[PDB]
Design a protein around this ligand. Structure first.
Ligand SMILES: Cc1ccccc1CNC(=O)[C@H](CCc1ccccc1)NC(=O)[C@@H](NC(=O)c1ccc(OCc2ccccc2)cc1)[C@@H](C)O
Ligand SMILES: [Mg+2]
Ligand SMILES: [Mg+2]
Ligand SMILES: [Mg+2]
Ligand SMILES: [Mg+2]
Lengths: 204, 198, 233, 222, 196, 212, 222, 198, 196
């Protein structure tokens, strides 16, 4: 009944050697009732990826708002928005609603197209930026996610290795949370190509 | 509590809505139609708070109808549902939000697919093979998880609902006075007006 | 249900190489009124234990009576009362811990935070804390109330783990205690300039210092402070 | 959070711990809490992190415009006045607690600001949960006419008292030295006494450990 | 907080302790509660620090604008401006201000504005949590037309009793002397005043 | 939690999940929600673990005592009423337990009693109890026949818990299966949902809400 | 109003081997944002080759351990010195806890020992005496941080055989006391990094068919 | 809300009681007999709070049966109803009061007259030609004010009852799964096993 | 209420105002707040009139029984009985009591028992709602071993300030003098003490 708990949902992002990964679960619940098995929580504007947990209506509203804004950006600037810049756009957009916030835990993943360096960021619901360079977590199993990442993570992982770490981090966190799970998608983001995998997991 | 069910088969979408309207200690009507036609190929069903329910539906209907006449063209189920979602999403943060849950069932003539959208009063939208609002979902979801197949005929879809209604008439505390059933397909919206004494 | 009335602030304390030091100011507050001025909050039991009490003073006075009654009772039919069967710090503590815990469990607590300090019969230092919930713990340094927030950080700079306690002389420890008391007097609005200090040593025994005062206070820099931002005169 | 400001004979220094928290959980282990208002006016926040950041950036923006307009160096009392007036207007609801410090044409300044908008002037100040651990150190060691070296050491030791003794504070010590003579020197991770020890074991998974349902390449361009 | 203002033969003196608390913690032990709103118009602040600082800033502003248009404002005028702000916004303010100033025609004057926003002209005035403890003392010892060294004594003694009994009061005692002479600042330290 | 027991041609099917929660935290996935009071008696557990665990274990002792005192096994009716009456003594103190007492005696036949901490005690052929009850009820009711084979009935039981484990956030882990006969409980094993879901999807063509 | 409960931090963790068991817990005791002690044991050898921790509210933790240590004692007096088997201890502890069903001990409690067949055994209880035997269990403040790790690294959950298309699981096996103590120290350094209440020191008790052995490791002090 | 009706005709008393037991969003049972026989010629029906309902009924039954064996005699319906009232009266000022409302229907062999007692959980007793507990009375009292006659046969009473059950099925918001009907007269208590579609 | 006890050279003196209020209504303007629990042990009561009367009556009972068996109770004994009742029943009593007595051995003694139930031996004690206004005055004017007439003056002045500021205090000032002499009841009317 606390808005950040109604639908349930986890996002995690990790950096590795010349790559980033962002993963999310697929459940959309209404309290105990599992409602949808296909609710993805990761979006992408150009090469910039946004995962959003929390109230699902806000998740949808935010994606549509950032599509809208990055489109207008691309038209005026005649280039794709960069992760660092987008982070700033997320931050100030959320703070614009300081006193009636969107109940969400946004995560940004992407590689800088000019410098090639991997970039991740998290935010709280009013736009405060978490500037960790290893991993970012969010959602109703964030506790479990922090536990997994801090144990499993190591710097400079190769994309195929990073896929294992992020997937194992997500999967095992999901499985200690009643409200998250029911499917998982992982994005592996390499400057040049993006592979998206759907995971096999417990449907309970 | 108000039963609003939707099931999407292969060539059509089927909506079933309860017929009771109950204020307090009395059932005031046993034949209420909890549905508005949005376009020749788009039907919306609704449950929720006493006043808001019909005002919202009609407000949506007038807007879609207006759009239709302005462009001499029928918006897709997907486009209609996004409109409906955005309306609810604005509403949730206004002074007095509409407390209305909806199912939108339509046939997309361009894609030749049937489409079912579940949207709650908060503006949470999802496409589903089958859907429900309120307490009824706590029974029907698992029943359809079992018996539902993606490639069913309309006639098979109507048997799946007969099962859903039966189950709700057995285990729900309240007498919802049967359901009105409507099919949305490539031809449009018709009423299977003989479902209760069937 | 209940609420403290007349209260008395921190009790701070640390271990050193031969024994323990404990101090407490002599104030008894009544809300924000600095009402009473010669209140002793250090209670010597035998001559190997000092009990320091903060919180509600009426409960403190009750625990005082309990401790005296315990010395009386231990003496009864006991020809080794001042030798092998003398009250140990650890006995006094366990007793109080029991009382405090039973009291919270009956939903009628003794509204206090207590540190028991002394030296065992084998020379070992004893330093343990108990409070109104019956929570107990032990550490090279212990403080109650504000002392927990301000004395500990300072005292821990001196004795940061067990292995620092051979290394810490009586003079160093007392200096640290005396300085910590000044800092509390600077920053705790429910505190007083006068305090008692006691040292329980494995050689010296019990040294109870009364009517101590905070000295060497820095106030001179106040004259330069004008306004709250823009004012120059 | 532990933040301090210490004045010395030719300027002012500020320091902070680098832990940010969400209730009992550490979200960021090395965040920057030292914000820049203008080149030589720096700031440290406590309370709602989004509020301290935002209020710092807003006043920082307006101070720049003010500076260009007036063709003058920004003054600390200006940052102070703008901040307090903004915070007051919000009767508290913007949870920013700041130590603002800097140098300008009139000298060197150290102030604190509370969320409701009251200001205090001082020679040494601390805010945040580690506030009392740091103040215990300052009251114990502060003296009139400190050198730059002494003020850096005192500031640093105070943050440390916060790191070790306050559960809301940890990791590393950030410092910024504003001297009347030269530029502001931002000293990031001045101390790093909380290095995470080497893991007992690697948890790198054999490839193919995770079961995959289906795979696909995502398109970026147009 | 302990604040007081006292009229005497040559002008008026404002006095105050230097302690600010949040709860039982002393946020500032060297606070300057003596506030200048004009050359020879000063005030003392009690209640919310936020509120009283915001109010003193607007008054300072109004009196500066006043001077540029109409010469020096009288002390009464300054009190009226304080009162206007305190009364009109009483609901969202917690402000207890004492206004004191020296004028050539009217010599020393003291005005007290308590919580509601009423104004009272007085020979002397006391406020803040500290003041309850010195009502008897102050009433028993104040005389009209005291000398400068007498008024300093009276403020010193009173505030030291206030400081002795109130936890929210303490630190150094600050005074501002307002006469024809000029403006004089005074400070007295615990070692000095605790002895009395 | 989801627990069910139903009567049919060939006795009683008792089926339960194995998930323990505290709030949204999954505390355990391998918990025992069935107690084997005696060779002919079973009890199920829903609600507060401790309340159930402690009072159903106690019920076991009370039943055993009846055997010694009366030189005869306790009737299901009487076993249920012991627990019923105990729970009633505690009404309003906040006990939280959903319970089924299932078993066989010669005089009664196979019998199921539902007993909760409100004091309600009912005899019937079908009960589902727990936050997942409605989900189990949906599957169970729509495929229930009196004449189901033993093999079919065990599966319908198995399938109904799966239904519930999938939809209800607070159910899951594994299915525990029991059959109660005139001779009378036999354990039909533990079935982890981790594997069972995918197996049942494959073999039955159900669960089309799930991608992949 | 008077609240009879507090929260002293503190995390505990038990893993059962084949012929051993470990019970580990950090040695830090906290209240709100302050540190009470850096070394206060909350794991205890209770006699009869059983080790115990009751974590959460230390006053209730200590009361329960005390009371159980007495159960062991009075079991010897009433049953001709019979050893108290781990399962019997479990059942006993349930009655202690349920005994206070309407004014609970506010502790998550764990016991470790060897079962009748000499196998490693771990039992865990909620505040009101619900209990289960388990292969491993974390309890306390960072339980949510450590449990999923153990699910992954002790019971190999979500780990499949490379190449088998995720259709064949990684086989569950017993771990050595060296491989267990590795997981423990890692679990705790992870927990220290991310949780403000966990730190200072780790104490592990190991139980074998020769008794109880103790091991201590320094943890981060921030 | 639990339907509990009673009508007194000329030579008998008829009790009708809803069959549903509902906890939460689920109907756990559709054949619940909310009745206890107190003696060969006295029947009591009950509705109220979940546990107290059966516990109260069975406690009264134990007492009246004890009496019968002690005195080798059947207490008059009027004496049983007085006993029941006093038990409820004592209960209302006790630590945790029984939340049960009852109908007592009895045939008095010494007077050859049927008798109906309505007693609520407060111990409010009143003898009636017809009565009801809960919301059902809000419908049935007015119907029977109209349709009831003091000289009706048992068979006429059953028609009148059917008329009452039809009204409730139409207008009550809850599904109470029909009633179990029982007749108390000189030849004792008997159940009309067909009513649900009679 | 304004109540005080002061030890001096020859014994001890108790003083009190005579006002009892319910809200702003004066239920009694001539109350005797000076209560005898033994010949030369007296007390002043504050807080609940019901609570303190009931307490005083129990103490008087205990000391009468005490005198029958063991002889004259010490003041400390009297204070201990008061504390026992007040402490053991702190969670049903709003009682603040000042105890003052005289015996040949220990001379004049004063004990104050505030709300908690604690006991404090003091050279003098003030209490009641009017006391707050005289902390400064009393601490500044009390000396040890004053004469009878000096002490009477000190109470007279102290209580008149307390009366002057506190609306709950007022009426006449009653005093009880306790010495070897003797027991002496004094009274002072507004027309005398207001002019101080
Ligand atoms: C049927 C049964 C039998 C065996 C195993 C599982 C179940 C199913 N059942 C649960 O999983 C329930 C669901 C939540 C639920 C709980 C109670 C009633 C209904 C639903 N969980 C629990 O009972 C867990 N404990 C707790 O939830 C708690 C127990 C004690 C607590 O103590 C807090 C406290 C302590 C002192 C003072 C005040 C509060 C807090 C949480 C236990 C699996 O660790
Ligand atoms: Mg589930
Ligand atoms: Mg055994
Ligand atoms: Mg930590
Ligand atoms: Mg008066």
């Amino acid at each position: 009944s606390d808005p950040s708990s109604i639908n349930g949902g986890i996002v995690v992002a990790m950096t590795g050697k010349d790559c980033v990964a962002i993963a999310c679960d697929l459940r959309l619940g209404s309290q105990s009732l599992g409602v949808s098995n296909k609710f993805e929580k990761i979006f992408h504007y150009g090469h910039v990826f946004l995962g959003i947990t929390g109230l699902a209506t806000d998740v949808t509203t935010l994606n549509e708002m950032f599509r809208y804004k990055t489109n207008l950006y691309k038209l005026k600037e005649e280039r794709a928005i960069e992760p660092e810049t987008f982070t700033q756009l997320v931050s100030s957009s959320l703070y614009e609603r300081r006193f009636g916030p969107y109940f969400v835990g946004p995560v940004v993943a992407g590689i800088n197209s000019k410098s090639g360096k991997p970039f991740i960021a998290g935010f709280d619901l009013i736009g405060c930026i978490d500037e960790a360079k290893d991993f970012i977590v969010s959602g109703t199993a964030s506790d479990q996610l922090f536990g997994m990442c801090e144990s499993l993570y190591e710097p400079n992982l190769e994309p195929e290795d990073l896929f294992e770490t992020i997937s194992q981090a997500l999967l095992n966190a999901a499985d200690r949370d009643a409200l998250s799970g029911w499917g998982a998608v992982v994005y592996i983001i390499k400057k040049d190509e993006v592979v998206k995998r759907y995971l096999k997991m417990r449907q309970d | 509590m108000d039963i609003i069910l939707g099931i999407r088969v292969q060539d059509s979408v089927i909506l079933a809505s309860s017929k009771a309207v109950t204020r307090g200690i009395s059932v005031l009507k046993d034949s209420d139609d909890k549905t508005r036609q949005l376009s020749p190929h788009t039907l919306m069903s609704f449950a929720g708070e006493a006043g808001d329910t019909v005002q919202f539906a009609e407000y949506i209907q007038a807007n879609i109808q207006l759009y239709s006449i302005r462009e001499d063209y029928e918006l897709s189920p997907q486009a209609v549902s996004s409109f409906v979602r955005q309306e609810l999403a604005k509403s949730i943060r206004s002074r007095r939000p509409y407390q209305v849950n909806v199912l939108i069932g339509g046939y997309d003539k361009k894609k030749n697919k049937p489409e079912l959208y579940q949207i709650d009063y908060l503006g949470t939208k999802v496409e589903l093979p089958y859907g429900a609002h309120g307490y009824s979902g706590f029974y029907t979801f698992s029943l359809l998880d079992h018996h539902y197949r993606p490639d069913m005929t309309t006639e098979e879809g109507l048997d799946l609902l007969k099962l859903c209604v039966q189950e709700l008439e057995k285990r729900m505390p309240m007498d919802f006075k049967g359901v009105i059933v409507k099919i949305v397909d490539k031809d449009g919206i018709r009423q299977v007006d003989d479902f209760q004494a069937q | 249900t209940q609420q403290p009335i007349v209260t008395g602030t921190s009790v701070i304390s640390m271990k050193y190489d031969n024994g323990v030091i404990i101090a407490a100011d002599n104030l008894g507050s009544y809300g924000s009124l600095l009402r009473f001025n010669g209140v002793e909050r250090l209670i010597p039991v035998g001559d190997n234990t000092v009990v320091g009490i903060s919180g509600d003073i009426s409960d403190m006075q009750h625990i005082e009576r309990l401790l005296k009654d315990l010395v009386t009772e231990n003496a009864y039919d006991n020809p080794l009362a001042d030798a092998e069967e003398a009250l140990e710090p650890s006995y006094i503590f366990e007793y109080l811990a029991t009382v405090m815990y039973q009291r919270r469990s009956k939903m009628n607590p003794l509204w206090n935070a207590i540190i028991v300090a002394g030296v065992q019969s084998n020379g070992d230092q004893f330093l343990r804390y108990v409070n109104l919930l019956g929570v107990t713990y032990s550490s090279p340094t212990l403080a109650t109330g504000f002392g927990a927030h301000m004395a500990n950080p300072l005292l821990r700079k001196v004795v940061d783990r067990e292995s620092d306690i051979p290394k810490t002389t009586v003079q160093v420890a007392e200096e640290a205690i005396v300085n910590a008391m000044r800092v509390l007097y600077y920053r705790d609005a429910r505190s007083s300039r006068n305090f008692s200090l006691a040292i329980i040593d494995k050689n010296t025994g019990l040294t109870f210092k009364k009517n101590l005062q905070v000295e060497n206070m820095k106030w001179d820099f106040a004259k330069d402070i004008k306004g709250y931002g823009t004012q120059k005169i | 959070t532990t933040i301090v400001g210490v004045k010395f004979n030719n300027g002012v220094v500020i320091a902070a711990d680098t832990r940010s928290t969400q209730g009992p959980i550490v979200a960021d282990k090395n965040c920057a809490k030292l914000h820049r208002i203008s080149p030589k006016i720096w700031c440290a926040g406590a309370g709602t992190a989004a509020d301290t950041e935002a209020v710092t950036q807003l006043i920082g923006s307006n101070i720049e415009l003010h500076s260009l307009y007036t063709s003058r160096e920004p003054r600390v009392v200006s940052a102070l006045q703008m901040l307090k007036q903004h915070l007051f207007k919000y009767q508290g609801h913007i949870g920013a607690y700041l130590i603002v410090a800097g140098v300008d044409p009139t000298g060197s300044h150290l102030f604190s600001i509370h969320a409701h908008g009251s200001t205090d002037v001082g020679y040494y100040l601390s805010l945040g949960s580690g506030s009392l651990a740091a103040m215990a150190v300052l009251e114990s060691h502060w003296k009139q006419d400190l050198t730059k070296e002494e003020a850096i050491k005192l500031a640093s030791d105070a943050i440390q008292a916060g790191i070790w003794n306050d559960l809301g504070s940890g990791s590393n010590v950030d410092v910024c030295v504003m001297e009347i003579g030269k530029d502001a020197e931002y000293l990031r991770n001045y101390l790093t006494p909380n290095v995470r020890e080497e893991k007992q074991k690697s948890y790198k998974f054999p490839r193919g450990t995770t079961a995959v349902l289906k795979e696909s390449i995502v398109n970026i361009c147009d | 907080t302990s604040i007081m203002a006292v009229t005497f033969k040559d002008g008026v003196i404002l006095g105050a302790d230097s302690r600010t608390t949040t709860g039982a913690y002393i946020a500032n032990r060297v606070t300057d509660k003596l506030t200048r709103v004009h050359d020879k118009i000063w005030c003392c602040r009690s209640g919310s620090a936020a509120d009283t600082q915001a109010i003193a800033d607007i008054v300072q502003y109004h009196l500066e604008l006043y001077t540029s248009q109409y010469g020096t404002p009288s002390t009464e005028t300054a009190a009226s401006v304080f009162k206007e702000l305190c009364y009109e916004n009483k609901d969202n303010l917690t402000a207890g201000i004492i206004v004191a100033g020296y004028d050539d025609k009217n010599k020393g004057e003291v005005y007290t504005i308590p919580l509601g926003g009423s104004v009272h002209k007085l020979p002397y005035a006391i406020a803040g949590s500290g003041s309850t403890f010195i009502y008897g003392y102050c009433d028993k010892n104040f005389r009209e037309n005291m000398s400068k060294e007498e008024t300093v004594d009276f403020i010193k003694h009173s505030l030291s009793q206030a400081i002795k009994w109130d936890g929210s009061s303490g630190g150094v005692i600050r005074m501002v002397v307002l006469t024809a002479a000029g403006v004089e600042r005074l400070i007295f330290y615990p070692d000095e005043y605790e002895q009395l | 939690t989801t627990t069910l027991a139903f009567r049919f041609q060939g006795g009683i099917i008792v089926a339960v999940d194995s998930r323990a929660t505290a709030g949204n935290w999954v505390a355990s996935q391998t918990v025992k929600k069935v107690i084997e009071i005696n060779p002919f008696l079973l009890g199920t557990m829903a609600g507060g673990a401790a309340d159930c665990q402690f009072w159903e274990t106690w019920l076991g002792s009370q039943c055993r005592l009846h055997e010694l005192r009366e030189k005869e096994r306790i009737s299901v009716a009487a076993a249920s009423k012991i627990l019923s009456n105990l729970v009633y003594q505690y009404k309003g103190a906040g006990l939280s337990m959903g319970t089924m007492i299932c078993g066989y005696t010669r005089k009664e036949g196979p019998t199921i009693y539902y007993v909760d901490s409100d004091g309600t005690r009912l005899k019937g052929d079908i009960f589902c109890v727990g936050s997942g009850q409605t989900f189990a009820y949906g599957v169970l009711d729509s495929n229930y026949k009196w004449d189901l084979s033993v093999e079919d009935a065990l599966y319908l039981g198995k399938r109904s818990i799966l239904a519930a484990a999938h939809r209800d956030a607070y159910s899951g882990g594994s299915v525990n299966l029991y059959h109660v006969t005139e001779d009378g409980w036999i354990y039909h094993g533990n079935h982890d949902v981790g594997e069972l879901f995918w197996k049942v999807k494959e073999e039955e063509g159900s669960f089309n809400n799930v991608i992949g | 109003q008077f609240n009879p409960y507090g929260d002293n931090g503190g995390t505990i963790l038990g893993i059962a081997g084949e012929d051993f068991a470990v019970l580990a817990g950090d040695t830090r005791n906290i209240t709100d944002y302050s540190i009470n002690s850096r070394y206060e044991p909350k794991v205890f050898d209770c006699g009869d080759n059983i080790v115990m921790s009751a974590n959460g509210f230390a006053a209730d933790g200590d009361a329960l351990v005390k009371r159980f240590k007495n159960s062991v004692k009075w079991y010897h007096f009433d049953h001709n010195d019979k050893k108290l088997s781990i399962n019997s201890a479990a059942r006993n502890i349930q009655h202690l806890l349920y005994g206070k069903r309407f004014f609970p001990y506010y502790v998550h409690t764990i016991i470790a020992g060897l079962d009748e067949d000499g196998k490693g055994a771990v039992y865990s209880f909620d505040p009101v005496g619900s209990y289960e035997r388990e292969q491993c269990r974390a309890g306390g403040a960072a339980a949510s941080l450590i449990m999923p790790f153990l699910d992954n690294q002790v019971n190999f959950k979500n780990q499949y055989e490379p190449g088998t298309n995720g259709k064949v699981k990684k086989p569950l096996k017993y771990l050595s006391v060296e491989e267990v103590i590795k997981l423990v120290r890692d679990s705790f350094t992870s927990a220290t990094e991310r949780h403000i209440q966990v730190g200072d020191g780790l104490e592990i008790l190991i139980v074998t068919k020769d008794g109880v052995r103790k091991e201590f490791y320094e943890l981060k002090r921030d």
